[PDB]
Amino acid sequence: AAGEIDESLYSRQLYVLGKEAMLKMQTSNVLILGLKGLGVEIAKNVVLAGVKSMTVFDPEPVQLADLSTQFFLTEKDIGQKRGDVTRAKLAELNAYVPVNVLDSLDDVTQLSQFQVVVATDTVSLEDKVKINEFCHSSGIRFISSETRGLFGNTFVDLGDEFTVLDPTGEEPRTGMVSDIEPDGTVTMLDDNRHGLEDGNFVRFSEVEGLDKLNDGTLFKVEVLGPFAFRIGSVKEYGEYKKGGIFTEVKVPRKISFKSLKQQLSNPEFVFSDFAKFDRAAQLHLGFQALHQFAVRHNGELPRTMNDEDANELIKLVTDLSVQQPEVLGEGVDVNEDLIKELSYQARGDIPGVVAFFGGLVAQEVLKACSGKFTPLKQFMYFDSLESLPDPKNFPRNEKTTQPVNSRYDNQIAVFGLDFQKKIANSKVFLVGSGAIGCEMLKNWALLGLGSGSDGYIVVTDNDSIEKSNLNRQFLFRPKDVGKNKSEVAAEAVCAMNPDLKGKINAKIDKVGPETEEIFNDSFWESLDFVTNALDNVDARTYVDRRCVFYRKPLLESGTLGTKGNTQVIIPRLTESYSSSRDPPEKSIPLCTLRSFPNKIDHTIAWAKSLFQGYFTDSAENVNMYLTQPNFVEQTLKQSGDVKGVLESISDSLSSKPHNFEDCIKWARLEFEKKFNHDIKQLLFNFPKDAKTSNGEPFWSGAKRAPTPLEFDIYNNDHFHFVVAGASLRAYNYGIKSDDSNSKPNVDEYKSVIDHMIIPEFTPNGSDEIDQLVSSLPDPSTLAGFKLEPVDFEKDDDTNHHIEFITACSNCRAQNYFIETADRQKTKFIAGRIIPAIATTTSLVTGLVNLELYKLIDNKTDIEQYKNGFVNLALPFFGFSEPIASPKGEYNNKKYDKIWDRFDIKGDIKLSDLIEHFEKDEGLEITMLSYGVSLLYASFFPPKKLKERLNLPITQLVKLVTKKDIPAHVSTMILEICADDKEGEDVEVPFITIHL
Amino acid sequence: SSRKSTASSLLLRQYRELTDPKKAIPSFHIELEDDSNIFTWNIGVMVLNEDSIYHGGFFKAQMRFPEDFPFSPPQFRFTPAIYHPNVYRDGRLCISILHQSGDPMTDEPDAETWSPVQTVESVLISIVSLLEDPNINSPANVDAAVDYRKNPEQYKQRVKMEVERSKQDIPKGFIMP
Ligand SMILES: Nc1ncnc2c1ncn2[C@@H]1O[C@H](COP(=O)(O)OP(=O)(O)OP(=O)(O)O)[C@@H](O)[C@H]1O
Numbered sequence A: 001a002a003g004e005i006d007e008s009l010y011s012r013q014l015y016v017l018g019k020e021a022m023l024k025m026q027t028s029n030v031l032i033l034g035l036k037g038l039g040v041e042i043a044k045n046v047v048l049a050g051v052k053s054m055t056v057f058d059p060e061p062v063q064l065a066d067l068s069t070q071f072f073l074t075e076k077d078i079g080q081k082r083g084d085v086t087r088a089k090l091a092e093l094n095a096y097v098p099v100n101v102l103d104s105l106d107d108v109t110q111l112s113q114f115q116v117v118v119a120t121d122t123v124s125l126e127d128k129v130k131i132n133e134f135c136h137s138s139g140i141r142f143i144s145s146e147t148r149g150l151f152g153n154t155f156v157d158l159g160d161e162f163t164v165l166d167p168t169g170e171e172p173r174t175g176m177v178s179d180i181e182p183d184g185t186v187t188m189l190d191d192n193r194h195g196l197e198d199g200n201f202v203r204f205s206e207v208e209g210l211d212k213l214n215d216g217t218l219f220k221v222e223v224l225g226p227f228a229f230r231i232g233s234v235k236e237y238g239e240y241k242k243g244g245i246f247t248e249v250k251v252p253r254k255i256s257f258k259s260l261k262q263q264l265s266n267p268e269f270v271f272s273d274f275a276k277f278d279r280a281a282q283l284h285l286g287f288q289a290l291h292q293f294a295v296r297h298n299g300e301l302p303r304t305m306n307d308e309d310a311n312e313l314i315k316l317v318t319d320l321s322v323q324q325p326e327v328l329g330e331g332v333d334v335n336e337d338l339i340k341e342l343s344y345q346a347r348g349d350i351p352g353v354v355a356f357f358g359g360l361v362a363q364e365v366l367k368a369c370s371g372k373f374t375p376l377k378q379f380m381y382f383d384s385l386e387s388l389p390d391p392k393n394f395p396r397n398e399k400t401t402q403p404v405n406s407r408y409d410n411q412i413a414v415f416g417l418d419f420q421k422k423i424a425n426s427k428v429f430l431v432g433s434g435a436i437g438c439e440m441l442k443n444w445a446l447l448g449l450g451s452g453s454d455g456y457i458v459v460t461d462n463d464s465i466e467k468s469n470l471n472r473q474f475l476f477r478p479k480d481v482g483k484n485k486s487e488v489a490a491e492a493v494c495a496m497n498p499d500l501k502g503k504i505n506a507k508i509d510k511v512g513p514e515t516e517e518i519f520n521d522s523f524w525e526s527l528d529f530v531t532n533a534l535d536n537v538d539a540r541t542y543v544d545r546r547c548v549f550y551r552k553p554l555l556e557s558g559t560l561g562t563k564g565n566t567q568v569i570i571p572r573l574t575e576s577y578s579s580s581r582d583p584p585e586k587s588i589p590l591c592t593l594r595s596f597p598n599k600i601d602h603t604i605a606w607a608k609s610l611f612q613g614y615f616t617d618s619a620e621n622v623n624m625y626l627t628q629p630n631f632v633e634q635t636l637k638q639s640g641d642v643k644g645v646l647e648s649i650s651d652s653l654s655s656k657p658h659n660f661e662d663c664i665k666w667a668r669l670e671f672e673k674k675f676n677h678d679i680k681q682l683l684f685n686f687p688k689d690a691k692t693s694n695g696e697p698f699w700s701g702a703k704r705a706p707t708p709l710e711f712d713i714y715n716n717d718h719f720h721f722v723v724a725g726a727s728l729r730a731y732n733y734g735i736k737s738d739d740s741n742s743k744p745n746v747d748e749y750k751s752v753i754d755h756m757i758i759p760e761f762t763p764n765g766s767d768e769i770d771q772l773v774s775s776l777p778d779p780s781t782l783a784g785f786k787l788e789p790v791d792f793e794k795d796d797d798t799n800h801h802i803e804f805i806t807a808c809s810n811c812r813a814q815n816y817f818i819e820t821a822d823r824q825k826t827k828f829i830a831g832r833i834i835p836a837i838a839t840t841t842s843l844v845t846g847l848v849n850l851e852l853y854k855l856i857d858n859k860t861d862i863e864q865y866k867n868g869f870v871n872l873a874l875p876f877f878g879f880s881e882p883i884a885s886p887k888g889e890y891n892n893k894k895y896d897k898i899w900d901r902f903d904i905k906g907d908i909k910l911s912d913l914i915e916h917f918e919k920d921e922g923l924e925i926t927m928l929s930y931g932v933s934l935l936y937a938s939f940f941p942p943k944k945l946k947e948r949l950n951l952p953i954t955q956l957v958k959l960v961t962k963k964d965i966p967a968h969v970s971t972m973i974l975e976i977c978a979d980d981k982e983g984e985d986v987e988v989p990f991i992t993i994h995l
Numbered sequence B: 001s002s003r004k005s006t007a008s009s010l011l012l013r014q015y016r017e018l019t020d021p022k023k024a025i026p027s028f029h030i031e032l033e034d035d036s037n038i039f040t041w042n043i044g045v046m047v048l049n050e051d052s053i054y055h056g057g058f059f060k061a062q063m064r065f066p067e068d069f070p071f072s073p074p075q076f077r078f079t080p081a082i083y084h085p086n087v088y089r090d091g092r093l094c095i096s097i098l099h100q101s102g103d104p105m106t107d108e109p110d111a112e113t114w115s116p117v118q119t120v121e122s123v124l125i126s127i128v129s130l131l132e133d134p135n136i137n138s139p140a141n142v143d144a145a146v147d148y149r150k151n152p153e154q155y156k157q158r159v160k161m162e163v164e165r166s167k168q169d170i171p172k173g174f175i176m177p
């Protein structure tokens, strides 16, 4: 086991943490003191990540109030020990991680068994300081965390020596060099960015002229514009000639941590909101006072919404400020109202907050185990008082907030009974049931959202469960693989809070245009708001455009590895998601793809394209050619490389294999074509020593001269190109392979390749398509004959897909002296896998549920909302208020450019439309479009204009688009360009035709 | 704040701008396919200046636009693949302007890249400017490249035959400007 990582489970997490990091995690034993919501959330996340063993310590008996945020406790468990009822359910999350229970902790020395000790809100500050001194002086990593209502903190102490090995987890920067001067000024190539900050370190390779500068030596970086940097003298090494590629390196960093006692007096802060800087110090005293209080008052916290205890705490804070004047700062008074809010909420347990700190803390643990990412140094404090509703609508006093013998008791402690009722009666749509979706549903079960007689949840997802999802989508188990995410997940949370039983509508419908008959005008008009747990841009902008049309709030979010964001979309007030979208990855120029690659990304893109061509497009085309008797007409219409479609057909049929050995020969021959003949061919067309552009050698800069390959079955990439090509072609023609039986023996393949003849490379419009038509077989000769197309599945390691692409890419990499890449890197690029971890997912989801509270109060003050960006690598928190909507003006009338629209009753006539807008709005419709089609234009010729100008809109659509409008459709959205009274084009709202 | 307008509307406005006879822009005939798909234009390209080797040639083309215009680029391909040093059998082109530069773009500092501020007329200007002055820093593995580099008479002979084939597709369609 020692040194292996189950890639099928951990794939998405490995791309975040790396192999090395995960191996150090698998030697580390973690202990968590206190298993309420904060504990179980931290533990859930650490156990999913994969450490050596998880041990939990909580002997106290279960109470109903503890069910506010502990998703693993039920009503039936009351009275029992929290550790014992939590451990079994924790154990289910990762069979590779054993979960144990510490009966007792009166012997502090038991902590020596452990590598990381996390102490939650059940441990006194007295005991926290004791346990920390023991950890600090024994070399054990100590982390601590507390939630008090809508407030919270975390404290990190990794000891006198700790080494950060990779501080950001981002991939190292590189770039091609054109010149190195004696003083060390590296000038880049042809206008590429390096991306390097001051004090980075870099190595060089392929630098001709400076021999021992390529041997692994590091150079510190002084940046000189975006296209240059300096690295000190280089006269000793030689004199620059040509070529060269630099590569960034992260050097280790030794950092030191101070004990908890030392930091209570002199804390080091990491800020969670730069708009609340001043609160950090206030809360540092406050949180300590909350312990001095509990010592004085028999362990009890301030009573909920109680003023006596609040003024007592304000006293305790003032007194502490006089003991510690550097921690509050000169001339800085106590923020009495903040401390007052702290006491009013000391007893609260808020799902969204418990999730925020659970995810963040779980990550601080993996950094403690592994040396990956920069730990928090050292204290961090957080509040979300912007979640509180307007006191006028929902009063907060000692009667609104008292308990009522419910699970939601410690949420009422913050918000009041009537407000929790409003949460319960909410009608909400959750699009997607994946990592964010599962965390969202747990949070909603803990909230009771939709549990009311007026409320409900609709959750939808057309995907199933795969094993790699079990690492962060924790409502699913290995026995659930294959089932539908939404149905398993809704069943899963009704177990957790049976108050939701029968109130979650779990669909398996994909959200897009084709399912608008299920999700109809009536479906949307009922909802209070919409929540996205989507992973792709088409689904996010479709849901967005639908929330704009129906004027419904939208809660959008997302994660990339350690990074996450949240966005709040409010009708009539903020921008939508589509406004502030991201630009998809740059397409690779066709010249770099087809003839002059310089990265492995170019050989994998080329290799995928070739996979898709060989084993999918070709079968699809042969089966279309035998099925559709007018394929040739549609293919001549179909402009792109028609001769290559017809040559694909003719190849598939003129030489079809009948046994596996013919597939082997085909694969070896293709090897020769792609990597020997085609390379020699390119070299004939542009010779190695060709000096074409300016007098300079042709293969200079980003152009690398290739070398034809001499097949060597002992070269692993050469071998697996033929093994995979052979098995995939065998699949295309329904030919049983001997490798599906057992794994491939090289002597078998070598015996066939040894008795093969290898053609030498010979270097050298209407007739060309007709002779190919005549050569093709007539479909009538081939009965029942089908080719089986291949459907690229990246996550099946037996199916030869990534195997072929790896080999193919890497062979082409050999061709162009590009370093090869392993199976996992190819899977990541070829398969476009997004790195994911459960820690970031939980944190983001919590922040989202802290904005949901604001939606329930119909808040319309844009400043009360918070859009989040986190990077747990750093760790960095950065909130900002949402951007207000663009506004526009036509004819001195102002309108909202995202949300406003003209409403028109009935399937009006185009003429009546134009006249209605000139009389009523002063706009002269110039151009009018429906979806993708242009219906009307003011510049149209007479014959085009008169036939269109007389039609009603639905008939107009049918005329222009050649399609009936369905009967289910109730409304249509039209886009117009128009002129104003002055004759100048103006941007104007859209039109909603209520039929 | 550059391109607040819709994608559909943006292409329509640039379609009306480039099809206006009064505007009269530097010779480019463009019309939508089936006057219905906004996001797929058919474009006839004629060469302006006599000094270049492609003068007096009408080469048809299609421009396909993506849903997220203009923060992605459009695809361009000649409806008949032509004899050009930067044209593959497909009809697709080696141009630096139709690909994104990547990472923080910040200034897009020295030359020729796709941006949101970039316009369709700009793409069409650069297709013509690359046609009349071919670019040999990014050649394509077509016969046309090798012939331009050695500089035999065959290069200009196959340019002429292609310009004659291009002239073959102008009479159909009364108004020839
Ligand atoms: N158009 C859509 N309608 C409804 N749900 C969708 C749509 N598109 C994507 N989704 C869903 O959103 C969810 C996103 O979750 P997530 O990406 O965390 O899991 P995943 O895609 O299975 O994981 P992996 O990224 O490792 O393959 C998926 O279940 C996906 O099927």
Ligand SMILES: [Mg+2]
Binding pocket: A535, A834
């Ligand atoms: Mg995904």
